[PDB]
Structure formats: C-alpha cells, structure tokens
C-alpha cells in the first residue's frame, strides 16, 4: 500500500505558518520520484541526503510539515536561517536532514480583494526552538509600560496577515511549503522507497 503524500500535497486546505501542520507517515511505500521529478515545485532541496537515494532508502518515520508563506520568505525555511518566519513561526534545526519543497499557490490561495486567512507571527519575546509551534494571541509588550492584554495601545497583537492578492509581485504571492523530515532510530524501518 502506497504512502499518503497526495493527502499532504493535494490537501485543499493548508495551514498558516504560525499554526503549521505535521502529518506522520509510516507503514507504507513511498515513491519519492513522484515528488523530485515534478517540474511544478518551484524549490526542491534535500539536506544530508541526495534526492537520488530517497527511493533506495528506509526510515522509521517520515514527518511532513506543511504551511503557506510568501514568496521571498521561502529562503528562510532552510536551516541556519533567520528572519521573521525562522525566528517566530517555523525554525528548522541545524542538524536537519530532509527536503524542503515549495510551490506557488497564487491560483489557489489568492482571492480578488486579498486573502487574509493566512497569518504570520510578527513579535515574540524569544526565538522558537526547532519545530516549536506557537499559537498564542497574548498582546506583545514591546514597550516598558505594562499591558493589560485587553487593549492594543503601544502593545501589539502578535499575528499579522498576508494580504494575498493575485496581482501581487511574485515575492508577495502565496507559496505552499512541505518539509519532509526523515527519522532513523534503532527500530525496524517502516517507510521505504520502491528500490529498497
């Protein structure tokens, strides 16, 4: 029985980056070649593995994380990166092995008027640890004055929205991203490729 990659890439709904998703894939056969050979991804790099070897490999688990960011934020998904998305929304670790896959969703996630359902976290008292996920809505105290939470004031709401319009530059267009994470523990493997 084949793996549910289609459930991950073709999901009609994809999360907001601050509330990114994670599906655990196990006990199936993965023909990764359906992914790396696809001309439709705008971005496709594996780290610590050469994409050739994926179909000849066997992992204990595979973890698909999925979200939507804007075009010029995609350079931040990769490990060792900093900036808004890496510091406050989604952070890969430095020892990361796995692939980062992206593709422009402007036809899917843009609406005439702007699609505001996609949000990102603008402020945080400290950086995320790798793979931490933060869905707080507490009011950020950027300033020395204590905030009573109820009000904005000089304190700020933490989540800001992407204004996703079709006519935006390619930098400010939605990009669905999937991050595969390959875990090899000293347990019998459960996700292999067709050649393995």
């Amino acid at each position, epitope marked *: 029985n084949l793996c549910p990659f289609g459930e991950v890439f073709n999901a009609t709904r994809f999360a907001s980056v601050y509330a990114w998703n994670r599906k655990r894939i196990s006990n199936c056969v993965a023909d990764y*070649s359906v992914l*790396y*050979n*696809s*001309a439709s991804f*705008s*971005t*496709f*790099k594996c780290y610590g593995v*050469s*994409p*050739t070897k994926l179909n000849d490999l066997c992992f204990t688990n595979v973890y698909a994380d999925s979200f939507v960011i804007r075009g*010029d934020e*995609v*350079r931040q998904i*990769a490990p060792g990166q900093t900036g808004k998305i890496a510091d406050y929304n989604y952070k890969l670790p430095d020892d990361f092995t796995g692939c980062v896959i992206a593709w422009n969703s402007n036809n899917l996630d843009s609406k005439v008027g702007g699609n505001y359902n996609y949000l990102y976290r603008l402020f945080r008292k400290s950086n995320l640890k790798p793979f931490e996920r933060d869905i707080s809505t507490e009011i950020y105290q950027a300033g020395s004055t204590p905030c009573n939470g109820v009000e904005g004031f000089n304190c700020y709401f933490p989540l800001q929205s992407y204004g996703f319009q079709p006519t935006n530059g390619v930098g400010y267009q939605p990009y669905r991203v999937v991050v595969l994470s390959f875990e090899l523990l000293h347990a019998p493997a459960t996700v292999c490729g067709p050649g393995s």
Partner: antibody
Amino acid sequence: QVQLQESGPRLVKPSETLSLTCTVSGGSISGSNYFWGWIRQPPGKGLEWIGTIYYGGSTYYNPSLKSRVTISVDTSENQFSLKLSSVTAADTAVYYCANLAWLRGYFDYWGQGTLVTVSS
Amino acid sequence: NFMLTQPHSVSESPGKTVTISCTRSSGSIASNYVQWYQQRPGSAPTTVIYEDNQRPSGVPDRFSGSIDSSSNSVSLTISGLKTEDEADYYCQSYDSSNWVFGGGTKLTVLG
C-alpha cells in the same frame, strides 16, 4: 556505465532540417528513469540547453527553439533524436547529448559532440 | 526564464586560490541546485560540483562550492591551483521547465 554517441550529417544547408541521433550503450532508455537531453555550443561560445526528454512522456524544450525542435525516442534501437527545422547560419554548433538522473540533477554522461556547419 | 552570469575570465598563479562567481538574473539562485562543469578544449564538459557543495567521484577536494544569497550568486573556488586546472568553467541550474547554463569563464593558470 553509460556511453553516448552523437550521429548525423555534419553539414546542413540553410533553411533545411537538422537531424541528429544519440545512440546509447550500457543502459536501457526505457528501463532507466534517466532524463535525456540535447545541449549545443556555437564555436567560441558557451553551452546552450536545447531540450530534454523523459520516456514517461513529458518533454522539455528551450522556449527560444520550441517551434523548431522536436525530440523523440525509439526503444527498438535504444536511441533518441534531435530534429531542428528551418535552420540558418546561427545553428552552426557542436551538438552534445547528455543524460540526467533526475530533473534538476546534473548532466552526468555526455557524448563526444558532433559539429554541424550550416552553409549552402 | 533566467540567466546566469559569470566573469569572462579569471587568472592566478599555481598554488594560489581563485574564485568564480555565478549570479542569477531573477529568482533566488538558492531555489534549486546549481552545478559546475569544467570544459577542456575539444572535450565535452565534466561535472566538478553538483548540488552546490558536492564533488563527484574523482574530483579532488581543491574544488569547493558555496552559496551567497545576499548577492544571489554561487561560487566555485579552487585552492591549490594546479596548471592542469586551466580550462573553461560553466555553472548551470534549473527553474520553471528550463535548464540554464552560465556564460562560462576562462580560468588561466599563469605561466
């Protein structure tokens, strides 16, 4: 261990159709999942991708040549072909065939190259 | 579509170090893998670096690769320059449904 060999006429008249073939030893075009491309370079000038093909069915062409290029493959003789219609003095080049192990890979195994000159 | 741009030539003495730049015209050079070919006159080009930082079996470790997204360039670098390294070098990538070669660069080991 795959070997590639360009074959075809090294002199084409202007306005005619240029036709090359890349016979492949050591691997099976259909049995492999490699990509198979054509790359050319005019003398004294840099390389220029022409087109790649994949035996699954999808074929990719340089958009500056799309109307003039077609690329085919027949398994019976294990080779793939280049055809460049409406040729002019500007298509004089060394033509190379190369393979690729995955879309977005590197061109691993190359032919020696064949020079075609275009002149009546 | 995009272009890759390299210098026309670089030159340095044997044993020194030389770097060759490859700059994408548009899009992020970091989007997809970038490769480096050495071309000796009369031969088909050889892969020296693939996936930006990798050397194929055979290529010595004097050849290294590096990304610099701040300038949208990648760089091939040869230290311990040796006269046999005198050749033409091309970078290549793939975005959209096109593969692109750089202009090429004529390295010269100085004699």
